[PDB]
């Protein structure tokens, strides 16, 4: 946050806890809005043999 240190002290004394450690507003620690592409594995029934449907 952009609050001055006196206001930080007043907030921490009024609430009784250090508010600057755990802020309600999220600033820059969240994930990027652009992500690399995924790969997404397939599954257990994607075999080429020994995979007759009557057995599963």
């Amino acid at each position: 946050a952009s609050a001055t240190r006196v206001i930080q002290l007043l907030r921490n004394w009024a609430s009784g806890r250090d508010l600057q450690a755990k802020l309600q507003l999220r600033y820059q620690e969240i994930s990027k809005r652009t992500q690399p592409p995924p790969k997404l594995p397939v599954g257990p029934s994607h075999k080429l043999s020994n995979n007759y449907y009557c057995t599963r």
């Binding site: 075999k47 080429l48 043999s49 020994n50």
Partner: protein
């Protein structure tokens, strides 16, 4: 009836059934015509007693394998429809129905095709599968579709494009053709790939390995 079966009958009648049954093992009676072709010094057609061992026939009537008996790679004993057998089996196997059935290869038409150690076995089996693809009548679904499918798969196997898992897939595909068609042409197409996979799987695997390593 086959022409050989019809043609031997008057001689059997004249000389008696006992004379014909004196040759060969039990339930494997009589004489037989053999066509030895492929990698032999003297490919030919001969008449011989039924249960003659394969090695004796090859080295006596066909002049032996080209380059010596130690140069032998594989033998197709009864025409294209029979599974091939490696050199280790041909040392003691006999040329009749029962012994070749116990060798998982069958006697067929007694047409021996000899492939030496300079043979690309995958290419030979793929050529046989191409023959069967060109000879299928197309009537029933398993032959009409699956034989073409196996032809494409074996063509890719020859280069090495495939992955090892596909080998098992190919096996299953053949099993889906055999016993599910109108006539026995489907069986005759399924059996050669089964023999090739049974006896020469490392060759296919190393071909795929070399293709992958060459093409990143």
């Amino acid at each position: 009836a086959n022409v050989e079966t019809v043609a031997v009958s008057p001689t059997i009648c004249r000389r008696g059934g006992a004379w014909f049954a004196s040759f060969g093992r039990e339930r494997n009676s009589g004489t037989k015509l053999f066509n030895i072709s492929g990698h032999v010094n003297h490919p030919c057609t001969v008449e011989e007693e039924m249960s003659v061992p394969l090695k004796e026939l090859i080295e006596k009537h066909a002049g032996g394998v080209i380059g010596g008996w130690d140069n032998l790679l594989a033998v197709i004993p009864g025409g294209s429809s029979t599974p091939l057998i490696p050199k280790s089996v041909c040392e003691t196997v006999l040329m009749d129905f029962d012994a070749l059935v116990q060798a998982q290869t069958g006697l067929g038409t007694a047409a021996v095709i000899v492939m030496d150690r300079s043979t690309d076995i995958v290419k030979a089996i793929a050529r046989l599968i191409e023959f069967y693809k060109h000879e299928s009548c197309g009537q029933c679904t398993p032959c009409r579709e699956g034989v073409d499918w196996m032809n494409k798969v074996m063509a890719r196997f020859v280069k090495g494009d495939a992955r090892p898992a596909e080998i098992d897939s190919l096996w299953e595909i053949s099993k889906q053709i055999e016993g599910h068609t109108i006539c026995a042409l489907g069986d005759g197409a399924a059996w050669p790939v089964q023999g090739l996979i049974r006896h020469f799987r490392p060759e296919l695997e190393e071909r795929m390995q070399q293709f992958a390593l060459q093409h990143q």
